[PDB]
Amino acid sequence: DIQMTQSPSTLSASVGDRVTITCRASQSISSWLAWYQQKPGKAPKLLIYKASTLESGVPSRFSGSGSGTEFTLTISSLQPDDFATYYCQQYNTYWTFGQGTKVEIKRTVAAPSVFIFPPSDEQLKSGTASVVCLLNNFYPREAKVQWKVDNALQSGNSQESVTEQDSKDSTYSLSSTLTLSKADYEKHKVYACEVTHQGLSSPVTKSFNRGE
């Protein structure tokens, strides 16, 4: 298969910025490359085809260049409507899409407020323990969350979920949920959530002891 790689995976920008996104093909696709815009929950919209031809109805701030294996999409002056995910598509042989580049709203750094929640007694008696760590209203998106149980680093038993950029303050919020059997939960005392983020002068840990 022809593999398509977009870079960067995310990029932060402001209204009025000039924005450039790149797409690389694993082999030559001549100029058979298209670019799309997609907003959450909506069908994608074609912007550019044959590498540099503007689709019918598309504003002229969008342009494309390249041929062979390396391509760019440029937005000459970003507008509020342009925050979205962009995909390239080769159509040399069938169709293959790149993995996408999200274009998001840039703002100042904001540290997460971090909160840890023990499992409820109601939930425990049913045999499962969910431990929740909340990182609230932070920017940028990049954040590392580590779980520690009696100082042993956890791995493979947690899942993260993240909100879309807030419409008022352009921050993200994130949950990390550690799932244990009741039996394992009861085997340990200290449950800690440690977060690393640019807004923090060093990593912050929130914790509780089982039963206090």
Place this chain on the structure above:
Amino acid sequence: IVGGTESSWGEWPWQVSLQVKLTAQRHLCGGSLIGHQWVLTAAHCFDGLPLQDVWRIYSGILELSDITKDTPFSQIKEIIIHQNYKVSEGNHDIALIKLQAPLEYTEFQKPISLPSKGDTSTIYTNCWVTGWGFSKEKGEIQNILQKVNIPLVTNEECQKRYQDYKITQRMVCAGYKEGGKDACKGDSGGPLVCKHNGMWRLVGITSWGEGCARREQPGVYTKVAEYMDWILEKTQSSD
């Protein structure tokens, strides 16, 4: 038509609207009356619906909203697509339509003259394109027949803007360097006419182009003068 203005009764008396009736009825293409029983249009108008029975041709008409269930229309007796036209492509984009009945001429319904054998090398300077097509890319069919003045360009200039396609001597292109005035979707098959020595001549048939009214992106038209032997053969031969 992008950047045009409203036409008047009698101004372009050869302009027709080629419409299709299925459940609903829609204008699809323009065309030009060239004799009592003959309309000239683009072959591509028939790529999707090649059969005659669904088509309705309105002549002597300024405003599409005037059309009702009772408005008379001509029907297609014969479609003659150029034998070397390829579906979906730009070469030989020309079709003759023979009507089921001949139309009488009036001041609001009469033919455009075809180019004269004498005018092979004429450089036409007062050219106009008409139709009910969109007034912008992804717009809507216009109600009142629009007109716009557009200069011809050389084939060499046109070729510079269409690197991916071949511009041939059987095509002619028209456009402004900075765009703003052009044909658009729904104008295709209609006329490009130029006034020469006091008379209007059918110089082009609206055929294809990238976008509508873009800078350095002229419209492409079938060059009618190059098809005169074909027109006269197919018409004289048929009637």
Place this chain on the structure above:
Amino acid sequence: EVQLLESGGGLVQPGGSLRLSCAASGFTFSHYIMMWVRQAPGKGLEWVSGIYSSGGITVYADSVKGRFTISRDNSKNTLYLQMNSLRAEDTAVYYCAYRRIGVPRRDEFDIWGQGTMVTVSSASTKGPSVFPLAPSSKGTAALGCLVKDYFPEPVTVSWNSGALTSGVHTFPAVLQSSGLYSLSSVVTVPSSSLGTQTYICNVNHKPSNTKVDKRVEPK
């Protein structure tokens, strides 16, 4: 304009089959390449099948080759995707798309449908268990509701019957290895309010016709 409307999406069990339709409306003289493209929850667009001309090359992505059949009924003006031996990982929004053949005629290169949702799962329909995320004993406090083990999507969560909206974050659900979904909804409030104010999350799950209100209190 020319318009495309997908239908036939829904919930099917692993190993089952489903047939999507994409009905085209309008008049056009254009011819089109016809494709199906899908997007799994939180993932990218993935092309899966196409037909290049009437009775022409039908082609498939390796991910679906041998299980899916693309076809056209020109008399109904409809594109189909027959999907057999379906699996969890075929879960996605499916889109049909048309691509213009030949020279540009003042018109569009692409036409896209609206998408139709396909869910492949052996899970049983079930309303969520709702557990409190109690505000800690140790400015601003956070509290929430853990909405666990429901199927299928979606659920809705409100706080105090819609009276509390400021500072609410309801997370996108996660698909657990059990095949059931889970999410949390949180809210930040003044610490000084924890003793006097009542906080209740209202969790609705239409597929199971369940509504649960859960009071969230200091522990």
